[PDB]
């Protein structure tokens, strides 16, 4: 998207979201990142929304195909599951490459650095969902390392109700439960996160209260399913 102005790419990503054209939205935001400037808060959210929708559709398709393949156990179901898997891996590698070149290294404020490290954990987690064997081990460790660095910064630099801090903890708890085979660590992290947020709600405005309590309810929903 090298010939399109940064501001036009941002504008078009917002239009693509309204039109539910998430592949276009992700391509516009990739173009915007590749202009080389840092991203504002709103721009970071557009990047994350675009890719989460693209990879979310791929993951849902991969799960349908993997289920059909497991039930059947010609080459067609495996071949097509492999096709979708390779496409998913390519999208995850693209996002990880944007984070590595050069969004994380330029992110100095806690809000930006935690946001990008949470993305890095999420996209390694999606790689881990489709990985097997020893590849799976190193990919799992890469997710864990990214989430852990984000957690360490978030606990030092953000209040316990901050929505990015909350969503990081939610997604790291899902990583523990679903990827790392550590359900007790998942439950402990979700409970501690919920309780420490509850105790800080009194400091919030009405609108911030709504933002934080929405994520707290997601932590509660997981705790109800896990306990």
């Amino acid at each position: 998207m090298g010939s399109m102005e940064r501001a036009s790419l941002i504008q078009k990503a917002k239009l693509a979201e309204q039109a539910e054209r998430y592949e276009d939205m992700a391509a516009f935001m990739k173009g915007a990142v590749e202009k080389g400037e840092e991203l504002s808060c709103e721009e970071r959210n557009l990047l994350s929304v675009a890719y989460k929708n693209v990879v979310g559709g791929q993951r849902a398709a991969w799960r349908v195909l993997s289920s059909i393949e497991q039930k059947s156990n010609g080459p067609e179901v495996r071949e097509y599951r492999e096709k979708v898997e390779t496409e998913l891996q390519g999208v995850c590698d693209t996002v990880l490459g944007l984070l590595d070149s050069h969004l994380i290294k330029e992110a100095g404020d806690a809000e930006s650095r935690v946001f990008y490290l949470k993305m890095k954990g999420d996209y390694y987690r999606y790689l881990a969902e489709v990985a097997t064997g020893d590849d799976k081990k190193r990919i799992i460790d890469s997710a864990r390392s990214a989430y852990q660095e984000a957690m360490d910064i978030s606990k030092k630099e953000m209040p316990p109700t901050n929505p990015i801090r909350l969503g990081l903890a939610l997604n790291f708890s899902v990583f523990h439960y679903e990827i790392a085979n550590s359900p007790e660590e998942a439950i402990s992290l979700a409970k501690t996160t919920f309780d420490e947020a509850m105790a800080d709600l009194h400091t919030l405005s009405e609108d911030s209260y709504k933002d934080s309590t929405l994520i707290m309810q997601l932590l509660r929903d997981n705790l109800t399913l896990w306990t």
Partner: peptide, 9 residues
Amino acid sequence: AGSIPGRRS
């Protein structure tokens, strides 16, 4: 288990 849906700006 639900992660952040994260699919709406």
